[PDB]
What we know:
Distance between the termini of chain E: 35 Å
CATH superfamily of the largest domain in chain E: MHC class I-like antigen recognition-like
Protein name (chains C, D): Beta-2-microglobulin
CATH class of the largest domain in chain E: Alpha Beta
Function (chains C, D): Component of the class I major histocompatibility complex (MHC). Involved in the presentation of peptide antigens to the immune system.
Strand content of chain A: under 5%
Structural class of chain E: alpha+beta
Number of helices of chain E: 4
Distance between the termini of chain A: 22 Å
Organism (chains C, D): Sus scrofa
CATH architecture of the largest domain in chain E: 2-Layer Sandwich
Oligomer: heterohexamer
Largest sheet of chain E: 8 strands, antiparallel
Largest sheet of chain A: none
Radius of gyration of chain A: 8 Å
Domain Ig-like C1-type (chains C, D): 4-91
GO cellular component, one term (chains C, D): extracellular region
Shape of chain A: elongated
CATH topology of the largest domain in chain E: Murine Class I Major Histocompatibility Complex, H2-DB, Chain A, domain 1
Shape of chain E: elongated
Amino acid sequence: ALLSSKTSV
Amino acid sequence: ALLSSKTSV
Amino acid sequence: ARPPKVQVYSRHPAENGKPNYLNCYVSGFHPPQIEIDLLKNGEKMNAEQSDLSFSKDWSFYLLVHTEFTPNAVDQYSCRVKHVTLDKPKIVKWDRDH
Amino acid sequence: ARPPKVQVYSRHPAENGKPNYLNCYVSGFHPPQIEIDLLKNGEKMNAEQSDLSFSKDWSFYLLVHTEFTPNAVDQYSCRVKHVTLDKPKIVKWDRDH
Amino acid sequence: MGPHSLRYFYTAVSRPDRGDSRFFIVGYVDDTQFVRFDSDAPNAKMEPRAQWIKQEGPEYWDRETQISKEAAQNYRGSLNNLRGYYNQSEAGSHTFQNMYGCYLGPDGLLLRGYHQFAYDGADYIALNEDLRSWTAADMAAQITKRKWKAAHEAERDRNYLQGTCVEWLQKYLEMGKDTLQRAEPPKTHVTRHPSSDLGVTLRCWALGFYPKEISLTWQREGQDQSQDMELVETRPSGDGTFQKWAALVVPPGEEQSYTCHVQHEGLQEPLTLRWD
Amino acid sequence: MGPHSLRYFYTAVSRPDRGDSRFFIVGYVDDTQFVRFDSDAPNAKMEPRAQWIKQEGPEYWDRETQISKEAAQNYRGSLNNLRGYYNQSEAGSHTFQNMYGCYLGPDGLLLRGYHQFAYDGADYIALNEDLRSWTAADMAAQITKRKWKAAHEAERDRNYLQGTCVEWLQKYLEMGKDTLQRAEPPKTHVTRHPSSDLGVTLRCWALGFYPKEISLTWQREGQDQSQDMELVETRPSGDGTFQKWAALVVPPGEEQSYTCHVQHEGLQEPLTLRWD
Lengths: 9, 9, 97, 97, 276, 276
């Protein structure tokens, strides 16, 4: 199951 | 659990 | 920028007239862009390539493969080109390696 | 008839004044009869010995062990006697091995 | 008997001449790949890559595909930002990578959690082991480190790692137990090639083995000389298994006095082999 | 993830000067001993030797103890016969050994079954792999081979191996899963000892590891030289775990350029170590 990231560097 | 042998060589 | 290592080998022990698979494993390179071809007497073979992925040291790896049939005379190789290499890199299949 | 190998070492890394365990592992011998003693300055220590057992090549092995406390000066060894050896065999503990 | 891992590998590549970027995902359970994603694909989806995952329904597939598509975009943004931080050239292609996942103790808890990033093949930033601070490899990462520090996303990350990832890892293991939970011992043999009239090569072969780790040593009469043996790097078989060999030159007629030793999880007992 | 085994080791020793014999049994699941028996002990019983077996009731204990005591006697008879077959000397002590047990595939079936015997440390007779013929090492074994051939006890033996032993192996695994089914990764470090003013020894240490198998190599810059490293034989820790080291001499000031590599089932990932 993929991690979800809402934030760019 | 041990094997049981009734016979000698 | 890292050049890529290359090993060329058959999935199974190589027996003339039996069907096999020929692999070309290309690893330790950066950046990721690259062209790998399998050749049967200089002639580009139609082959599969695995999903781009990479190791712990960020270096990428790829497996390029196809079904083959070694025989007494057929000559096979893997050809790789990458920005790190002025020229194309070729490795020869031999059934003992 | 096979003579026995012997390694002498502490269960944990050897730190002065901390409590440890001292082992003497005696293996590869035949026949099975044998006397193994642990010594602290030539002086026989009261130690435990594992149930006689043996490897794939029929050679026997045994672990003789006891709680100890290394310090700066205490000197320890394992002494083994077996029919294969004209004389008793002694190996010295040292904390780096 | 062994720790298990769930692990993903993201690669983002910019094409400025193109003016666009390409995004890849591959997922692994242990050494086995099970999913991939590619953004160039016309109707891009997260896609099975092992038989056992296919026993998951569309709702799984929609979710992952949804998230993979968000990822493409945040990652595309990252490349733009990275150029800004680095004041990077307009026309030059750049690479951004993220790898993360879970190690699982037989204690049912996360042994170790890792999230790491690199830019142009060089380390950029990483979640630390306590899963509550980042290490920044440079000044441009310090920025990110401040930016992520505020967003509190190491919170987001430790929670996923300690919960969600551990949770799915276990589910994956049940689903694919017939493959993921069986070691496959290598088929082995020894070959003989005359590297010299008076210099014979013996090659110890190990094929078909899963998982990847293996030990191949060569001994004569209980004597080991890997200072001398030629070893190849473990390479995949093509079918989910791996292959390695280790080879040495021996004096002719002395073949019988050499023993190749092989250790592997799948093996009943370590096996030593001689030529024959 | 790995094959498992149940395995017993019988040792019978004659004392003709004494005029009697001594009988030992030890049982192992994988590398872990769980039972022992000794005939010299005054009220001899089969006895626990791991915490987890103790969760078995007296009826287990009576059965095994019963059978262990029959074994003492048939074995004592064997020693007498052996002397007869060999026309052995009256006053000389002799040794008879039997080892047998089960390997278990993750397929729930017996991978391999073994029953073997030796007399005075030399192979005497063994059940073959198909578990339906014996190999006799000599003329005195041919006798046994005829004698057992008639009794049909390879029938008795294949049945136990393929049924009973496989069956108990599995039960043992559940009972002691917290120990038998967890790999314990080695605690590792590197030490430094000056074997010479200009000859420094580096020793890579691996302690506390279960199970027994392990791989310790030393490399410089991806270069391996076990032709040079000193390796000790894997030795037990005293507490159910094992210990090994591998050591080499390096030129002074070149320490950092050496990496010790360590592979083990318990490890998350192989670990390479440098001095520090």
